[PDB]
Amino acid sequence: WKPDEQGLQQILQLLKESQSPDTTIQRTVQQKLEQLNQYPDFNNYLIFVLTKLKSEDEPTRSLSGLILKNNVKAHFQNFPNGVTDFIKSECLNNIGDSSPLIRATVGILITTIASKGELQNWPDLLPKLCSLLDSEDYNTCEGAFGALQKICEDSAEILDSDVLDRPLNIMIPKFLQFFKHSSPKIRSHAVACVNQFIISRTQALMLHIDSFIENLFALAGDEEPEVRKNVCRALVMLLEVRMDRLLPHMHNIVEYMLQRTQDQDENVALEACEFWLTLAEQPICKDVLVRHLPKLIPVLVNGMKYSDIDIILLKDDDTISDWNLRKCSAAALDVLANVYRDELLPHILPLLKELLFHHEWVVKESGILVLGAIAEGCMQGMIPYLPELIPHLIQCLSDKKALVRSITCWTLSRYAHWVVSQPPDTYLKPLMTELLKRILDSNKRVQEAACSAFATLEEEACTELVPYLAYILDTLVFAFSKYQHKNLLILYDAIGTLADSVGHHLNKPEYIQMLMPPLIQKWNMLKDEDKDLFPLLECLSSVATALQSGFLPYCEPVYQRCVNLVQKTLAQAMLNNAQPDQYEAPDKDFMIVALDLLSGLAEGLGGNIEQLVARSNILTLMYQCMQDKMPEVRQSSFALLGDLTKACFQHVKPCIADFMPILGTNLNPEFISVCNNATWAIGEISIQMGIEMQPYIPMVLHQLVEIINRPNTPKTLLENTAITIGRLGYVCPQEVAPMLQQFIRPWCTSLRNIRDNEEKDSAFRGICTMISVNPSGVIQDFIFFCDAVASWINPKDDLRDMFCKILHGFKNQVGDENWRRFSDQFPLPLKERLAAFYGV
16 A cells, blocks of 8 residues: 555645644634544555655654554444554554654554453464564563553453453563663563563463562652552552461561652652552451551551642542552551550550640641541540530630641531530530531532531431421521532522431421422432432432421422332333343432332321322332342332321222232241232231232241241341231131241240330230130140230230130139149249239
8 A cells, every 4th residue: 555645645734734723723623633534545645654754844743643543432333444453553663653643643543452452363463572672672572561561551350351461471571680680760661561461360360469568669669650569569459469478577567668658759649659558458457557657657657648739639529539548558547447446545645745736737737637537446435535626626626727626527517426425515516516507618628528527427416406407497498599419409408408417396387487498499400410319319218207297388390200219210111121232221329229118108108198109100110120030129118008008008909819819928037128018018918908918828828937937037127027917817817817826926025025006906906816716726835825915014905814724724624733833933023024014
């Protein structure tokens, strides 16, 4: 292939035209480029310029390759074999071009053809590059190593599988040799290349571990930053993977690493710091580090100050980096605090005193952070200093620098549990007061901090907020008019938790007047594709639950949208199941919460829900959800079932014929929560169906008896199983009763521990009925029945009579003689219970 004279001038002009320093004129030409991208012959002209037309300036030639790259980035299959083969050959022959810019251009070109046009479609790429490493020209050798590094970074695991032969087995040992190269840049590429294969534990490397670690040490003290960075990086990774071989040198390592953590070069430091985080998460840390703590701690703490940049970059969505020296240091400190517990205080506490009361706010702020970082692990040791620290921090909330207010919000929240364990007036009251003001701070970052802190505080305080409800709500509902979006999400969480914490104490007319309007208002701002959907749901669900019946005027749009979401999800699930590559599998979590919020409205609204239930296909969907592959969906729906049974059985009855079957198959004890809710639904239906339960009784009853007698089964499942057993026997004694002998022993040992409530009364009514039908099935193990009856403190009058009849009838049926002997087994409290309660 050869370029055409005028064809060349076409492109050379086109390029000359995209040099333009004018947005208007430049973007006009970039247009026809796309029409030529079809013409795959165009790419031959494109590469020719870069690599052959040396009578042209570097900027232009570079641009040619930089454009060709993009024709690869989108639509590269469009390339003919003869074209790619030409680019590949031209690239490899110029890899180490005399010019620096061209070399980089050629480089990024190879890189891209390798990843996008996958590795096996370039069979002899690697061995040619490997060979090129040995080239005597530094530029070609370095250029090759550059490319090889990027390959290793891009497609490490591909090179680490048979999908391309086993090319690393030659590469790794070859790289390891270049560790002793005379150029600092080359040494860097070599270690960077290898580092790609530590965690993947690739054999080519792991079987040369000692060889590797050795050159790693040889390079520890290299003056060139990038080499040191990589060495650190290597050692950090080695920690997770080959600790065995690193152990014998551990002390020399931490010594190096400590020195590195304070390196002048930002990057080396942060790489070293990672070491402390990683180390701290190993079981051997406690022993290996102890003697270094005195030097470790101060370095961490010192690293925990905001950098001068960090300061300016603050005093949008997260303006600071996701991860830096400070966050890493604190990360480590936090972890170490959980490792050493109170044993860390000797090294930190002297530092705190000096930091927390400092005139330079940058220093003070880092103090407050430390205080918060160490909170989880060193809690017990901190207790004695809290009576003076907590008030100090409350005072700090009023600091003039916003960045001090914000961490103070955080640090305080980290001690919430102790704060609520004190007399309310002393710490809780003033904290909560000051925290509320902070919520309305004029600085976005502080608002974020303060609202989160308060969310945390509410979880700890619960009913201790009840007296302050009106004051809380005021500032919370006002925040709606101030909070942008990032914070608005935290506000939802603060409101959700509030309701969760105060429970029914929120159910008061004037509170509802404040809260629901701006919530409902934001509910109508939504789409089923809105990012705010899920947080606002969970918020509204917590609120519904607390508000109980009081939620009535607000529930129609919430109810509606939830039933919608369930349909949306089941529909997309169907279409995916049919044609997976064509329709994306839906996110089931929305359905789960929707189901839950429905179960929530059913509990809160009881009777009044019936209207909304009637005018929707909730039960149809419910039916599908009960057959979902994912247990969480089945679990959530069985809860909704029982909830609907209880609330408005009239709309449910038509479906009982279909539900029961599915419920029957879902009695699987392995899926604990599904099994729990299935059981609970059964009992709830039996009560409703009444004597009509008869047909459905024998198809669940066998598994329930197998479950109740099954060992190693959660307390709560057994209890709920026993409750259903009893409940069936109440409405349909004839079917259930004749199995009394089998389930009586565990039934008693289960329910005797549960509080005298409706569920218990319900169940014992069932057991008493079943006895007056099959007295034979209980007389064996009557001692257990006595015990379960002794457990009652406040039985209903009638049930108390039922206990007598049984207790008496099966006493004088064995005589006063045998009874007295039978009564010897009872403890004083029990023997005296039945003696007092039922006339012995």
